[PDB]
Paper text:
The crystal structures and inhibitor complexes of two industrially important ω-aminotransferase enzymes from Pseudomonas aeruginosa and Chromobacterium violaceum have been determined in order to understand the differences in their substrate specificity. The two enzymes share 30% sequence identity and use the same amino acceptor, pyruvate; however, the Pseudomonas enzyme shows activity towards the amino donor β-alanine, whilst the Chromobacterium enzyme does not. Both enzymes show activity towards S-α-methylbenzylamine (MBA), with the Chromobacterium enzyme having a broader substrate range. It appears that the different rigidity of the protein scaffold contributes to the substrate specificity observed for the two ω-­aminotransferases.
Crystallization with a significant excess of cofactor (at least 5 mM) was required to obtain holoenzyme crystals at pH 8.5. The holoenzyme structure presented here has full occupancy of the cofactor in the active site, which forms the internal aldimine link to the active-site Lys288. C. violaceum Am:PyAT elutes with an apparent molecular mass of 100 kDa on a size-exclusion chromatography column, which corresponds to a dimer. This enzyme is found to be a dimer in the crystal, with the asymmetric unit containing one (apoenzyme and mCPP complex) or two (holoenzyme) dimers. Formation of the C. violaceum Am:PyAT holoenzyme dimer buries 5600 Å2, which equates to 28% of the solvent-accessible area of each subunit. Significant structural rearrangements accompany cofactor binding in C. violaceum (CV) Am:PyAT, as also described by Humble et al.. This includes unwinding of the α-helix (residues CV 317–322) to form a loop covering the PLP phosphate group. The N-terminus (up to residue 36), which is disordered in the apoenzyme structure, becomes ordered in the holoenzyme structure and occupies the position of the unwound helix. Residue CV Thr321, which is conserved among ATs, forms hydrogen bonds to the phosphate of the PLP through peptide and side-chain interactions in the holo­enzyme.
Numbering used by the authors:
A (entry chain B): 5 to 459
B (entry chain D): 5 to 458
């Protein structure tokens, strides 16, 4: 089909996630047709650099014919069987075993889902069930943060701190609370980032004491906030969050849906920041987005509590789906065996971070240049010296993002933050290629900003 | 790996849906390895008849090499791309256009998810967003039924009426209410099925008036309740439910996750019972379980309402997944082009129903022998005359289902209901082959009752 016709059929029959349906159907959808390595092509024939790896998830990049073969082979033998009827199958068994190999010690039990959002809902139910098993029925509140993102189920949307999501669904559901996010640029006042990390972590302590520790089940956080704009907390933050959770007997949960499977150069974001969660949620990079699968990695304390609780009345038809498991297995084994994660840690991550900071250092309206491993970002700001953001946060970021897309580069705006998370397998030449397009785009952005008299 | 090898790793590493992990680990998990047609082979080389089609979902049967090729092909060109970025891709656009021709009139727009549960969650947010768009911020309560099943998200479980689920996660969440299920055998008193259907339906009107109609956003129901035990509502039930919903400006939603894609003989469960829902949820048969994919089909009125509301701040990374959509597309085309649904209505459904009753009616403790299309059930009872159920609904079903298990037959126990939902492509010879193992299991079962002091 042509561009115009695929656009016509999409506008007529498709409801997109997180989209203005009326305005999209007017402008027309951009039709992505094929991918190879770090590159995409659209229906018009534009070669595009995918500086977002699909949706933070295509970690091995596009073009894995071995993954298609793994999919074909498994679908031919057993395309589906359920894990509900005192039943299992070799693909789910073999994946579970492999995951145990690459996860830290103590994470041997895994619960499968189809998505990061289902993993979060599963985790919420696990956390609350755990406290019931302990005879503490009031210990049910989960604390997340403003501008955190934990998916799109009613449960995950409530635990998330996106107001725009809360306003649709009568959210949050009860037993949720939120603390401010560890965003130093906005909230740091005259503290050092490290002083600020302690302050921002102790917001959890003061929330717990406001609520009553006996009512708090868990604190949940993305090691680095992804959708909120790659907010990288100070080094002092996570160890203090962990101290506080242990002080008050509150479960500690990492949402690893973005940071997992090598994004920071460790296998998991929590390893980078050096905390030890009781559970963590995954998806995305688990299969590099090649098939839908998510998981909850359940540490020993909680797993023992759940196993002591008899039946766990939860799950999805497609939990442990054999074909998705086969592809995840192929993916995880590749991340290990081809040295992809190790390469982020030791080679391409430090290169990207260095180049990133070199690239964006000069611009008058770029600040808070940050990142680690293969996730990185900056913020477009009104005045650097005053740490002053643009009003209507998001307007300026959108203008910038539009310059990127027109220049065949995918980087995302989260408010006025610009973020990137390319395939981990990106080469040095491809990093420089990407950064070259980005830099030219920021030159144009700075020129347009002065021209608008938005100076 | 051997049986014991697989079992040991499963106990060590895998937490299963809807399971007592301690006791599954102690017993050892049954390891399913391969499937063909309507049969499975396990780690021990038994030939097992799959009268549950995976999990009500393997509708075109096992062994569809053409599906594996569609998957392979799509995975090689573009294994993934997001639909969040003012972006789309051929496979999702193509599936969307195909669905609109097999779904009833006025269902042009689909929202993709990965699962039935996520579909239910999406439907809940849609219902509530819709009423906000309509300037009715109080119109937010969804009504389900006791023993209805709407998945396993916190939302779906709340809308669901399984007490055993509500007990885990602090459910239901707010703006959820529940009415009694149209289960004649227990609630029929002295009414005829058709009379009770009117009464069981009016329970909805009662609940609405109690809550207040201005607070009520939707009534949601599976056309035939599945996981609750294939409860088939009287013919009078759904039309009254629809009148009531229309009387009080309450949205009618069908959960078609089980009944969808040919299961009763129509494409959808609601078509069989002749109501017109404003939205309906789907998964399972959409891809015949070959790849995870679900959907919410939005009727014209609601679609109009959601579009007027600008941004819909909802969705999943793998929404519209290219590879799942290609496989869904190949499955839907197959169900239609290969005439598998049509055959359920005309050919195999009637046969299955007649023969089912013929096989099971004659038993002492088998009553309420029911079913339509390729979904069918019966209930294990203490006394047929008294409509007396066994004490502690569930004990007897297990005892019985465990006989099936060691006779290489899969039919599921829902309380003391026995249910079956085999692939739609099952042949008459297969139908007869399955019932014969069942009859013998039953003959065994009834005898084991007496020899126990019953
Ligand atoms: C994207 C995301 C999720 C939800 O995952 P889905 O697969 O889209 O349901 C949850 N947590 C985090 C941190 C995410 O980035
Ligand atoms: C199985 C089921 C669901 C949930 O679908 P999953 O894909 O398992 O999340 C929802 N509604 C009904 C009627 C179902 O049978």
């Amino acid at each position: 089909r042509t561009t115009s016709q695929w656009r016509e059929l999409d506008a007529a029959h498709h409801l997109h996630p997180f989209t203005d349906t009326a305005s999209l159907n007017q402008a027309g959808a951009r039709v992505m047709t094929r991918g190879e390595g770090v590159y995409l092509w659209d229906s018009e024939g534009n070669k595009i650099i995918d500086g977002m790896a699909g949706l933070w998830c295509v970690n091995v990049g596009y073009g894995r014919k071995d993954f298609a073969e793994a999919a074909r082979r498994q679908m031919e033998e057993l395309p589906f069987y359920n894990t509900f009827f005192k039943t299992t199958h070799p693909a789910v068994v073999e994946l579970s075993s492999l995951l145990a190999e690459v996860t830290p010690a103590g994470f041997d039990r895994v619960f499968y889902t189809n998505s990061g959002s289902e993993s979060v809902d599963t985790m919420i139910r696990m956390v609350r069930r755990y406290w019931d098993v302990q005879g503490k029925p009031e210990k049910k509140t989960l604390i997340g943060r403003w501008n955190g993102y934990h998916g799109s189920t009613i449960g995950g949307a409530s635990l998330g701190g996106m107001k725009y999501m809360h306003e649709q669904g009568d959210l949050p559901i009860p037993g949720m609370a939120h603390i401010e996010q560890p965003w130093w640029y906005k909230h740091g006042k005259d503290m050092t980032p490290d002083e600020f990390g302690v302050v921002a972590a102790r917001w959890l302590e003061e929330k717990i004491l406001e609520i009553g520790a006996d009512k708090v089940a868990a604190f949940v956080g993305e090691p680095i906030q992804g959708a909120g704009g790659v907010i990288v907390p100070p080094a002092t933050y996570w160890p203090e969050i962990e101290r506080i959770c242990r002080k008050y007997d509150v479960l500690l949960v990492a949402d690893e849906v973005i940071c997992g499977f090598g994004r920071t150069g460790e296998w998991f974001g929590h390893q980078h920041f050096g905390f030890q969660p009781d559970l963590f949620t995954a998806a995305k990079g688990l299969s590099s987005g090649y098939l839908p699968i998510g998981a909850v990695f359940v540490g020993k304390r909680v797993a023992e509590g759940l196993i002591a609780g008899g039946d766990f009345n939860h799950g999805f038809t497609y939990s442990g789906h054999p074909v998705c498991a086969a592809v995840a297995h192929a993916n995880v084994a590749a991340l290990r065996d081809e040295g992809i994660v190790q390469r982020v840690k030791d080679d391409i991550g430090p290169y990207m971070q260095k180049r990133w900071r070199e690239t964006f250092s000069r611009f008058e309206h770029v600040d808070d240049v940050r990142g680690v491993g293969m996730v990185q970002a900056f913020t477009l700001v009104k005045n650097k010296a005053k740490r002053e953001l643009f009003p209507d946060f998001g307007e300026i970021g959108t203008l910038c993002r539009d310059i990127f897309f027109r220049n065949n580069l995918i980087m995302r705006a989260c408010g006025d933050h610009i973020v990137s998370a390319p395939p981990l397998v990106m080469t040095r030449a491809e990093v420089d290629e990407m950064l070259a397009v980005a830099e030219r785009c920021l030159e144009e952005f700075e020129q347009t900003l002065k021209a608008r008299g938005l100076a």
